[PDB]
A paper describes a structure:
The best-studied member of this class of TBDT is FusA from plant-pathogenic Pectobacterium spp., which functions in concert with the TonB-like protein FusB and the protease FusC to import and cleave plant ferredoxin (10 kDa), thereby releasing iron from this abundant, iron–sulphur cluster-containing host protein.
Given the specific and apparently strong LPS-FusA interactions indicated by the CG-MD simulations, Ra-LPS and Re-LPS from K12 E. coli were doped into the LDAO micelles of FusA at a 10:1 LPS:protein ratio. The Ra-LPS dataset, for which about twice as many images were obtained (∼8 000 micrographs vs ∼ 4000 micrographs), finally resolved to a global resolution of 2.8 Å with the core of the structure extending to ∼ 2.2 Å, and the Re-LPS data to ∼ 7.9 Å. The structure of the protein, especially in the plug and transmembrane barrel region, is very similar to the previously solved crystal structure (average RMSD: 1.2 Å). While extra density, attributable to LPS sugars, was observed binding to the extracellular loops of the protein (glucose sugars in density shown for reference only), the regions of density were disconnected, indicative of stronger binding sites for specific LPS sugars on the protein surface anchoring a more weakly associated polysaccharide in place. However, the assigned LPS density did appear to cluster into four specific regions which were labelled according to the likely interacting β-strands at the membrane interface (β11-13, β14-16, β17-19, β21-β1). In addition, a cluster of acyl chains, without corresponding extra-micellar density, was observed at β2-5. Despite the addition of LPS being required for successful structure determination, no major structural modulation is observed in FusA around the LPS binding sites in comparison to the apo crystal structure.
Numbering used by the authors: 59 to 867
Amino acid sequence: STPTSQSMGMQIINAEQIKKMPTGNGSVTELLKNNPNVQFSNTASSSNIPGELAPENVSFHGEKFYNNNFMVDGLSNNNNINPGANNGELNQQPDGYSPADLPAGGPQSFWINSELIESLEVFDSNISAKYGDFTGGVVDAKTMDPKLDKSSGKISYRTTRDSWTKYHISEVISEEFYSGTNLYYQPKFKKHFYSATFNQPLSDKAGFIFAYNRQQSDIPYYHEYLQQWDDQERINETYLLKGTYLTDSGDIIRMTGMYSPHESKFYKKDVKNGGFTNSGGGYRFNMEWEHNASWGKMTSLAGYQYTEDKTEHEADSYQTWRRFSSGFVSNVIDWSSSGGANGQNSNIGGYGSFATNTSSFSLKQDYELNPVSWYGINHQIDFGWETDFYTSRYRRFSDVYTGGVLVVPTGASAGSVVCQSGDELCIPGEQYSRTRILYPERNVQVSNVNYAAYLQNSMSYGRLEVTPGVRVSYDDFLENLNIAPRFSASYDVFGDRSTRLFGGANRYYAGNILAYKMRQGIGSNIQESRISPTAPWTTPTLRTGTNYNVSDLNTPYSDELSLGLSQRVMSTVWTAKWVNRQGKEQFGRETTTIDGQSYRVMNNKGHTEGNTFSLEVEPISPHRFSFAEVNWKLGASVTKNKSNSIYYYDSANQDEQRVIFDDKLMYRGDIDAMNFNTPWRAFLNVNTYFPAVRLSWDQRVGYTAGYKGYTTSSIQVQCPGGSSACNGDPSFVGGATEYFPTQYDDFISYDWRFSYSQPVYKTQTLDITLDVLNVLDNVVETNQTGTSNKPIVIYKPGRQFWLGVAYTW
């Protein structure tokens, strides 16, 4: 029932469109590659990493990728704690690799698959006052719902593998890649994508759906000095149990359980017993009550959500031993974690278990009053409220002792090492730790309430629809009262839907980033020392490490302006919209002094202009022929995005640095956005169904502006006597970092996806499915790294086959 002016600002992708579009894993974000206002993070598709199951990071209209409202069934699917870690780049020491890491499951708590979703509502603009806690878009993943009559269901298996995935990889990383010695170089992998679904009446007005998904990847990893092969394993399970009782009153009570635990078994390079699992996601249970009174509709909701981004290492202490060195060699330590010729250190163990968890109880109530007429205008008064009572908690579960500095008595002194009988930091007759670093059991806790309320009029007269709304909201984290005007108009110009304009002016406010609260003492470690392996641990010496703190902050916001036209040219709807976002008060990092101690502190010093012109052409109805039905959607956009070099909430304000860019001297906040910001796209989905064969051949051909990779100078250009760029400021005596461009060619993306259904008997079908991503196998550049001395280019995947089978009744 969404109104005209807002419907041109949303894209609705139902189960049929999801079955049809060419698909990789089919994360909720991969489905967004048919929205012309979505930019993916440069690395999110990459030949280096075809084993990854995680959501591809998405910017809507140049806003921060962690500032979208990802939703599942109309409830938040967002990480309020650490959503944007490492700018969404695949950091080689995953979060958890070190004892002071605040874990990060990306911006989404639950990683739902395309299998589990019955509609995706992708709101890029003109977004209703119903939706908030974003500066970005909204992606409302309506998961599969009970059917009261069908008794139906599905089982599927989908798979891809290294031998089915052509790799385009740069020569400067090829031997490291094919060695398998790096967590995010994946030359060998297997993916298995299991699912089940049952959709059954308990009684004729009381359906339930049970659904299971199991995205799995196995990925061999090689420790080059420990000389071991270990599988990394990536798993996203999702269990969903949705029930719906349609009462005799016509009011629907819906019970919605979910458990979406995703895990990633990483390892620490050459560390013995060195494995760790970044677990994440968690569970839900909601009750929703859709009441359908004489006034209209009242969708009441209560629900619990739990999220637990957790690292668990395979040990809860960490030791550095020494195999050999000048004047010493050992018989106990039987591995190496280094390659040196004069001496070698050998590492064992890990940093125990630590987690950051949200426990959020949500109340909501959405009202949709029937159209009431006043002063000749019809008013559809939508209104509502929600309250998230939440506790966020980062917490280590056991004291992690770590092995500090090792003393290794040489020659005739070696026999002096006699350990205390319980000691983890001594080896008898070999060596002992002189210092021990305790990362203690800790609990940082923040209990908060976020209130929000809205009114959303949607009101019509004389061919207009005008949809004024507001969305007041208050988080007791920052204590900000945010008032968020939303305006979205439309006019059917020529008496009919064939020619109709629209536009809007909306302020969007984002959710909390609790990372600086959860870190308030992360890296607090107590050092202790001992003179001999029999002596006591003498002197607890706390270092609080890199401290973090909360500060008085405005909420990050995005001022949208939008305008557009929808036109019915000769059997096709052409919808064109411009959208401009002034992302403002966006978070960055600062250092400040409190009670004489230095703290890292969040600031509002970031901003992002993002600008799009987007075009969306589709037919009025599918074409039909003797052979086929053929259906298509030509999306396109031209885009321009900007940033301070405050890339995310941990980035410092490098805005004031001098750089040489576009062949002139300028401040670093005047660079074009390095991530996101491919200039343009033009994608044609065409879908074909051959009734003579039951074969569907669904294909996406998409031309896009080639990546413009920038590499830094290793030495800063002394402006005075260093570059013609210096004419940009002849007063500058200092040095500038130069950026050198490489403009890779504008490229044809081409993905196929076939699916043939075979009736097993009258009620049931077995479907064979075959994606072929990059059917051309073309080399496409997608990121570029480092200085001009080490230009590591990264590419989008080669030809990748995904076979699938789906039995259904």
